[PDB]
Amino acid sequence: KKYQLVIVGYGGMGSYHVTLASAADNLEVHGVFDILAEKREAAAQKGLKIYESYEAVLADEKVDAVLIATPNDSHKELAISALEAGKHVVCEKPVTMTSEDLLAIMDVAKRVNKHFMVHQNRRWDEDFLIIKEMFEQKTIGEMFHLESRVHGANGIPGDWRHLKAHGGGMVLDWGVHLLDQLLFLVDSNVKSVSANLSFALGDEVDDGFVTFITFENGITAQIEVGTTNFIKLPRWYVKGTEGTGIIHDWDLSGEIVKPTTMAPPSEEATNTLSLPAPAKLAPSFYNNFVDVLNNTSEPIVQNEEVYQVLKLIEAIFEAAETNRTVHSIEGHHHHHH
């Protein structure tokens, strides 16, 4: 069929999903719901049908799927409601505020036989796909250390991202993208996590963080988000047994430097090269989502992967708060103590 999607939450990302979803082959934006009149008015201006309630969205038999782009605390119940009403769900990152909440959603999805997919759009980021190529094709030999940094100097945007109750802060906002990229790329269990949160801005939520992650296969990674950074460190810095790579910024500027376990290095005998062309990740998120609904393809963004990321986020919070190194992503649910 031509699948019909309703946007639930017509804010900054929700309104951009009209563009994204419409770009897919057999998917259409059918309507919108938002609790704010001004947001509903803006959607009406683009010709979009406005629903009176969320209940009205779910009762509409013409609607095949919903996109949930609300603040982070509402995601879970909205998703569960949708799936219980027979609707497939695309949910904005971070899907839930705890890993146990995703499990519950996955239970519902399995029971009603409807699909739930996290919007992890940044696996398609070109900078990341250049790193993916390098990692897979051994451009700098065995890549054993990765540094992934998103720096800005604008603080925390909007309203709800400042608040703990709405799943605010930068681990949840940007950290989930970079952690999802890391775990998508590296096929290895997490051996250890240490972390520090930034409260430089004096908010009740983190305005940035750093985490040091070691994998079972010996790969180490540093993942960093900052909002108080008036000079930026590079987007990517990666070390391999046969070279080093850098990607400075979103403009994809950078280079590789290679020597002409590791051989004894010398700075006098090196060659500088361009970054390779990005790896392919095909099709787009929304085309893959339609393929998944049609049962023609396996999902690129798997709920099992998303689950591991949430546990990792839970490990990061536990590690920063106790100022300890944690030695698995298991055991941070705090159900029993």
Add this chain to the structure above:
Amino acid sequence: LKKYQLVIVGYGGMGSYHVTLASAADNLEVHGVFDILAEKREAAAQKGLKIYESYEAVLADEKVDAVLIATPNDSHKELAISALEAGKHVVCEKPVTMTSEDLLAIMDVAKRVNKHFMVHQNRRWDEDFLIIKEMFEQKTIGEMFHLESRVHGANGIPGDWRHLKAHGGGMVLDWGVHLLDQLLFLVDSNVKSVSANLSFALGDEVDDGFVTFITFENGITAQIEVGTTNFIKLPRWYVKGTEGTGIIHDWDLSGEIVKPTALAKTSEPTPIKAGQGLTKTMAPPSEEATNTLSLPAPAKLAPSFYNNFVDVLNNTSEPIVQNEEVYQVLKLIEAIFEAAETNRTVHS
């Protein structure tokens, strides 16, 4: 004419350079040289320097006031305690000892014999570091709360005895001591916690690099890193404060400072395409929101190490490199090694 006579013990790379360094001081000269190898004793003689046949002979010489110890790390403690007992003041190369307890022993002996022991922490005078010290003290970027200090290169481990655990080899003990000493000299706060990971990417029995994340009791954080397998270098300094950020790229002292203005609060950045999404928060701030400044002139550290050493001997000045500071660094190195070997975060 009241010149202190210094003997160089260990005529290797640094020991031969100490001839030049000690000679530049006002009231101190190089009386001569001892090395355990006859090859190195000949080499010193062929630079017109007096040579001793034994370390015992240096220490028996009434004309000698002080010794400079520039031997591999495992021999520092015995040679220092010997010189002290013989009534000689001591300058010892970094890292002074391989354990913190060893330095406490030397400190005890120096006190008992009423002689001075000083660590050669020469990189406290580094121009790049003194720029950071200027920024830190003058609040150039407001209150500096996070510092990242990195020495990267792709030349591996140099020599020699530095490849071996027995002789206190590896990068923590080589470059780490300089960077950690800089940090602890700058920050007037006790270390609260340390996590660390070592690099063994070259396959040696000692570390070819490390990274550590340090937190102080006053909330200041630091990341210190040395790497010898980095074909691309990250900046020498990257520092963050309540009112700006600074960067020193390299030893050439290139870099800048970027600070917020009072107009940043009422302005809004114009979004860019960042990967698959539009971003406002990670977009450059609007033109009105920031000021870009040159790095300041470096703070003054005066006088030179060796003139300060003489001033300490003449009892006219306190030491710049204090032994208690050197002790806290060695305790930090011990915390780092423990943190990395147990894969834990070490507290105190």
